[PDB]
Amino acid sequence: QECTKFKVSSCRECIESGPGCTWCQKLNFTGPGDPDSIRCDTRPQLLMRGCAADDIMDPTSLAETQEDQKQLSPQKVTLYLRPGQAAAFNVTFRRAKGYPIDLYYLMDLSYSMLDDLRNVKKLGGDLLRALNEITESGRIGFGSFVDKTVLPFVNTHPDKLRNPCPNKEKECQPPFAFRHVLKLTDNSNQFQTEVGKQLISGNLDAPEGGLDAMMQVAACPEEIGWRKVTRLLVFATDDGFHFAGDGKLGAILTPNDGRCHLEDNLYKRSNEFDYPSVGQLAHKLAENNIQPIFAVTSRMVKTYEKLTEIIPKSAVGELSEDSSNVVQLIKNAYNKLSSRVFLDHNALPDTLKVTYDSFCSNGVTHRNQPRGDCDGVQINVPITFQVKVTATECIQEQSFVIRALGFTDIVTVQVLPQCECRCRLCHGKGFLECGICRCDTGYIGKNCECQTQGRSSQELEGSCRKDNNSIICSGLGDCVCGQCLCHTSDVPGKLIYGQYCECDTINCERYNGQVCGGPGRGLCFCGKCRCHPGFEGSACQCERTTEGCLNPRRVECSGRGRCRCNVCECHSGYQLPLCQECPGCPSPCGKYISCAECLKFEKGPFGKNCSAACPGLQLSNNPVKGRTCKERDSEGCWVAYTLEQQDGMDRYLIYVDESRECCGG
Amino acid sequence: FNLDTEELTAFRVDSAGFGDSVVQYANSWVVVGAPQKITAADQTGGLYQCGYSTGACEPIGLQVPPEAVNMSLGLSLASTTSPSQLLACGPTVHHECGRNMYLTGLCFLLGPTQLTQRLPVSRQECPRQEQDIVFLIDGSGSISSRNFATMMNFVRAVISQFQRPSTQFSLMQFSNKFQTHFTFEEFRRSSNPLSLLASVHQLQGFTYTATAIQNVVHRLFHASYGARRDAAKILIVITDGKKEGDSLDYKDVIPMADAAGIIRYAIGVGLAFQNRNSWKELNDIASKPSQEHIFKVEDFDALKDIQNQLKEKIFAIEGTETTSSSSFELEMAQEGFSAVFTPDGPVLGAVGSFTWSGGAFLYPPNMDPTFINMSQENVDMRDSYLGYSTELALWKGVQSLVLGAPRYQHTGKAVIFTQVSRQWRMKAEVTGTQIGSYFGASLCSVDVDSDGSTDLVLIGAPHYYEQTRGGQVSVCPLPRGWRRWWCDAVLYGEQGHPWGRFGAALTVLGDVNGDKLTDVVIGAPGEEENRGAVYLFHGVLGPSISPSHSQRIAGSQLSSRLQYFGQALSGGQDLTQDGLVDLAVGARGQVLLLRTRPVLWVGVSMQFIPAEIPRSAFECREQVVSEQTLVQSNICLYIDKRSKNLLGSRDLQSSVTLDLALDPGRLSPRATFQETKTRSLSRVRVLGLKAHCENFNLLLPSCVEDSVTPITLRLNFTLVGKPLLAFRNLRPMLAADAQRYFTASLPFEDNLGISFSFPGLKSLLVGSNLELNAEVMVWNDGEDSYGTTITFSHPAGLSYRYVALHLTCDSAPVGSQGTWSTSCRINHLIFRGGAQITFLATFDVSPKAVLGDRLLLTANVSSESNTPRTSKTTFQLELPVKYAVYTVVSSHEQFTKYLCFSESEEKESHVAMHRYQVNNLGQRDLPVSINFWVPVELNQEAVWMDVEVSHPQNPSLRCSSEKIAPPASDFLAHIQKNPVLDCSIAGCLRFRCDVPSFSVQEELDFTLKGNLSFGWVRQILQKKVSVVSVAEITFDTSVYSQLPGQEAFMRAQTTTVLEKYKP
Ligand SMILES: *[C@@H]1O[C@H](CO)[C@@H](O[C@@H]2O[C@H](CO)[C@@H](O[C@@H]3O[C@H](CO[C@H]4O[C@H](CO)[C@@H](O)[C@H](O[C@H]5O[C@H](CO)[C@@H](O)[C@H](O)[C@@H]5O)[C@@H]4O)[C@@H](O)[C@H](O[C@H]4O[C@H](CO)[C@@H](O)[C@H](O)[C@@H]4O)[C@@H]3O)[C@H](O)[C@H]2NC(C)=O)[C@H](O)[C@H]1NC(C)=O
């Protein structure tokens, strides 16, 4: 491996220098004319110089599990970490089969959901039936939402407050932000009767205050009646939703505080607070382990699908026209939720970096991802995640937990530093440790035979200068007892080190205005910037890897440019960011005239090697978005065609008009 | 970094919602809104003007209309200058219309030089029921004078009680004669309705009521007379109930009227009521119920009390169309939700417009306000909340309008509108990414270089969510040219605030660090549990905003009880009267005015006397003596103020604390201050502008071990500017990035030379050469030299880049100004005589660097031992400099490809057109000339007639025509090679079109049109021939050079083929 010198005075310092460094504890391993900076080196170069295998000090990161199960194991871990060296341990996830479920059905009662309401009243029996087929201890609940009761969301005229529905229908209910109809119960008959009393409502604008409702459901676990079991929140609507910022139209500027505001099964302070943020809701949901199931109509599926990126444990199922398929929707959504398992860690310090290897029973395996991700998880078929933890520093006492998203079960990880050694005369002021003498304060020497301020005589300075033309200790250090003691500069991040004090941590190439990206992506060691985990480069000026080069479908700078350091390197006049279009290129209409002739009209010079002569052209019998072209063919007639460019080098989608322009012939 | 935190202005008014909206005004006041404050019964929102002088706020007196209910006045504020105007709005006006209640807005336009007026100019109107009303008055002899005079006053009273054009009137006077004084159409066209009633004179005569009513029904109620179809038809009959001589009875005409659905009112005159016969006459005329349709002639209130009627509109709620229902249009518009001032007038953003598809109203003075929004075709704009935020943008002359749509597809987007041919049109869009991030919530135009043209639009996404931080600001440079608008970079606040709402408020503070680049201020009202924070971002060359903040001010940092600090921002003006730009920050129940502190720059000059330490210092019989040799050091600190626009600023006193160190880091210091007893000294001195020097006494021991390395003296200092006492203890401060550590070397006790050359190039093209390599050879022919330092001096566009001999280099500005320098010290090495070092020094050449036509690179050479210098051996070399640019001309797709003509059409001709378009793809503006070469003749025979170059787009260009004579060749042979007619063989017509300034990415469109003749083809002896025109770009070749390798694209050509078939 690699080991580059930094702090060479001690054993622990030798380990702190690099993750590939080793220290030798052989007494008098050094020659009479040798420095002790050669005691610290790579394991091969130690053995090569004759350092015994027994006495080589190489502390290595270790993982030790105390066993304590079978869903999240082990639930206790202790990690001993060397800086730079990654410790690894395995986490086994075996899906449990019969864990109870609380399902809260949050129904949209806006007027657009009029036809949907009728099927929901029959839902009670079937919903609990299917729920009890999945697991035991089934519990169903119900709630309803419309919108904030102020303009422009709701017509606040007293007559249309009492009857919001456009038609004069007689079975209507005044608008409301959120009402809690039924506390979670095992009684199916209650559900049918209590939800049955609920009427249809209405309001003004299409998006509704559904997020207000969900936030309340998550913030009032006592009122709703969640058990500490698996929690499902079925969100059913035919339209969009209001979120934070929309309240300003009703002159509502106060952010949702994410707390319970229920007055008699009602959200009465709804107009005193703004709609919750999606980021707010996501946090509140994940914190209470409430997995939302978004049952939305076909027109709204793609939209609500985006929420699943912010909310890890959520699923979207398409709701049929009159909410007839709602039950099959929920179970299909539950499978989608249960088949995919995320493994993550709570908040991490700047010193610790954690990655995940995912080994799935699905037959798929991911390596070194920031979050454990396995889909297609089957019951009792165990999957394993390999956790890799790396420390940048020697660290203090710490504990961070790893849990599987959707479950309260946790894996407690203890983290202890590993910078020490356990190592198996000195002429006075020095006590000996790990094969070398560590002198008292004010004294320095291999056997502590010199004093910092004192005599320090001649002809020991022979070793102090690099060559015959070098200054003693490079002029950046003092020569004591034959070796060099470097000066101390008060400039932050500056340290003079080296056998002849020839190296400094300041001089390196610059990104931004600072050195090696400042105290960020990299640190500087004697001209070379040693980058922190996750970054690379000379001055570490390029950031990470290939994500700044992609089109939304990941084709990497179209096909017209190859990516280095996220700046797309593209040929000719194709400009940035994605190297998609060339404004300076000449019009390609001229050369493809023979290909257009052979594709459409079977004739022309390329008759019968049309396929071989036109590798980049894809013929379309319908008009295309490309650029207009028109040229003369082989026999002199004018042929019109259009060239739409696709991702790649000289790859076009060509359309040719069947009608040719001759003079008559 | 110069926002003053410790000396602070606090505005506290206990009104509900105070501080939700702030704005700087007239360089005098901080206008503050309190939209939740209850000012009157059924009226909300209040304004407060605040002053630095008063240190207090006073309510802004405004009289508000009664129909403006709960407007939330001050929910949005806007102001401008020259002339200073204030625009305060309230978009939540509740307006009752039928059983519906609309939501519109109202704004007040204020100014000291002018009178306060309102926007929109007129009140929102409820839709009223169309009703066509006919007056039928008895003008017979039985009606007499005061009775007939009363009837007219009754008519006048009624007409004044009904709005137009909801209600239009028609009057006919009857007797035995019928006269229509004014028809419906005449009434509607009438400039003044009341003017028509002046010419009405009584007809006397008999009384024919029935036949008159018939005449009214069969005439006065028709499309031909201007009667509306949907209008409720009401006929007012005014008579004394005495019918005489009429061949018709009421039972004959009344049923015919009932069938038409005509409502009838019977107004009784004189004895009409008391006579039993005359009373029946009234009952018969009036519609049922009779009691509700009959009144006296004296009762003017009678007619209105029943109807001031409206049409009941049924909305299409939740975006669902009923067959009967009607779509939202402007009823929920909420005009004035956001506001901004434009040169052509104020602009009020209306969010709820057309099912919340949003938009904006431009209000030019004394004209019809024009509505600005996405086209009707775009249905995805519904519920996008366009115009949630409004901001003005300017590129040179053109004024553009940016509107925010934070709800667009739940993602949010911003759209730029510009005027194209008397009508507004979308030019560009940019969409956010994360759902519910509210991208486009806040808009802020930034002019970085202050040329009057907007460079950079900041777009807020307050609710952008990441696990460890929240909020986001996208830096979006204007889509100049025809490039698609995209966001160049993104700004974030500090982390630990997942819901911190970074980007809720945006304002331009102006250049505060004096780099002649605009700095901006961004708010984050949600940070640390809704206390709030405010960030300051410096401007950056090649207009962009600095990725990291210069200064962050938390709410907790200034005060407890502070909530939502940064929810509103306004800066760029001076309100503290010290001439420095100030910042007004919004907060819950408070408004804080922060002031920028004046910026100071400190420079140091350090020298030793004598120059090189005489070696008589160390020569002894070994006496134990020390400090026998004294050395003087002259240290000068001159302080120039960076802020050149500060009122007062004549005596800027500044306190400085100096520290000193002799050979720091070394175990045994070789020097001592005569004063302190050690190697550490301190000084505290009050300093002003210009300069202040000071000498110090150094002591050197007789015999010392290290005589090789020079003695160093390290200097640092803290600077605390003395409060000015004028401007309320305002203090100056040292620049944050300033160098605190200064070091001078004192050498212990040669003739050197320098030489270099540029490998690879004889000339430097700026933009095409991003680096510069100089091969430097330094030699020492003579005595040995220590601490050899190689010094460079160069223009600003160059800098020393360290690549991967050993060198330690540092770079810092020198000269009057404009010149920089980089001196590279070499040690680790004794430089011995006869030995020479050659090394490659690399300079970074800025793409925008202005080096003129000449680049002078000078190289010094020196040693620790200071020679008398001026001994030549300073090498300068000059390099000719040109500037790169990418300019392309290309033949357009749409032109005249060919022309077919029969063998008998020689006499005739046909219209032919050639089109070229020119684009500046380079990074540099440039004066180009465009040349067009067109054949118009062949052997004095007409070929292309009346050729005219046109440019409808960019119609401020300027062209000329010049005839050309062809080099006389044997064209029949020249044609035979390839059948092409151009300037080589034919007579040409040269067009020169000069472009004084060709902007970057700008496109020029040209069109050469004319009549192509057929006859000349008979000279050719070919069946078909090509007619070619050539376009060529020319710029000053001495100052500019086409992008290397792309030279071929500077000329283009277009071909039109003349073919002749045979019939
Ligand atoms: C952006 O803002 C624009 C307005 O500037 C919005 O466009 C307008 O939408 C409203 C409602 O959707 C339209 O009102 C309707 O108009 C028709 C009759 O249209 C005629 O009269 C209009 C007014 O004089 C005029 O603009 C029309 O112009 C025609 O020509 C243009 C040329 O481009 C063409 O584009 C148009 O399509 C037209 O063909 C035309 O002369 C009227 O019949 C409607 O009334 C019916 O519906 C109401 C319910 O609202 C009902 O009560 C009635 O009984 C009746 O049945 C209605 O008044 C308006 O015409 C549109 N204006 C334009 C210029 O298109 C646009 O929608 C906004 N953007 C978005 C994304 O929403």
Ligand SMILES: *[C@@H]1O[C@H](CO)[C@@H](O[C@@H]2O[C@H](CO)[C@@H](O)[C@H](O)[C@H]2NC(C)=O)[C@H](O)[C@H]1NC(C)=O
């Ligand atoms: C954790 O488990 C994984 C997989 O179960 C282990 O990775 C495999 O290790 C075995 C040896 O034990 C190898 O034969 C396989 O080739 C490895 N997998 C792959 C994909 O190469 C991993 O070693 C385990 N780690 C610990 C600490 O037990």
Ligand SMILES: *[C@@H]1O[C@H](CO)[C@@H](O[C@@H]2O[C@H](CO)[C@@H](O)[C@H](O)[C@H]2NC(C)=O)[C@H](O)[C@H]1NC(C)=O
């Ligand atoms: C496709 O095949 C044709 C023949 O069918 C090739 O035509 C030759 O083209 C060359 C020019 O490249 C001419 O000099 C020859 O006279 C042509 N031969 C014939 C028989 O016509 C053509 O080159 C092929 N094209 C490709 C791309 O392979």
Ligand SMILES: *[C@@H]1O[C@H](CO)[C@@H](O[C@@H]2O[C@H](CO)[C@@H](O)[C@H](O)[C@H]2NC(C)=O)[C@H](O)[C@H]1NC(C)=O
């Ligand atoms: C304007 O706002 C005021 C207060 O914001 C409204 O007054 C309230 O009206 C409701 C009507 O149901 C009463 O219950 C409250 O008691 C009233 N509050 C106060 C403080 O008086 C007023 O109704 C609004 N006006 C309109 C037209 O909506």
Ligand SMILES: *[C@@H]1O[C@H](CO)[C@@H](O[C@@H]2O[C@H](CO)[C@@H](O)[C@H](O)[C@H]2NC(C)=O)[C@H](O)[C@H]1NC(C)=O
């Ligand atoms: C000059 O620099 C020295 C160190 O380079 C400063 O000394 C430090 O000052 C800070 C205060 O900012 C203290 O917290 C440190 O403990 C000091 N360290 C040492 C080693 O003294 C000194 O303050 C600077 N002088 C001035 C006037 O700014």
Ligand SMILES: *[C@@H]1O[C@H](CO)[C@@H](O[C@@H]2O[C@H](CO)[C@@H](O)[C@H](O)[C@H]2NC(C)=O)[C@H](O)[C@H]1NC(C)=O
């Ligand atoms: C310029 O070219 C146009 C052809 O586009 C000529 O237009 C013809 O004019 C004659 C005049 O008698 C008409 O009879 C033809 O019907 C026109 N042609 C078309 C297509 O409409 C025009 O004459 C030309 N101008 C000159 C001076 O010759």
Ligand SMILES: [Ca+2]
């Ligand atoms: Ca529906």
Ligand SMILES: [Ca+2]
């Ligand atoms: Ca709604």
Ligand SMILES: [Ca+2]
């Ligand atoms: Ca500008």
Ligand SMILES: [Ca+2]
């Ligand atoms: Ca600035």
Ligand SMILES: [Ca+2]
């Ligand atoms: Ca000021």
Ligand SMILES: [Cl-]
């Ligand atoms: Cl009469």
Ligand SMILES: [Mg+2]
């Ligand atoms: Mg709905």
Ligand SMILES: [Mg+2]
């Ligand atoms: Mg009469």
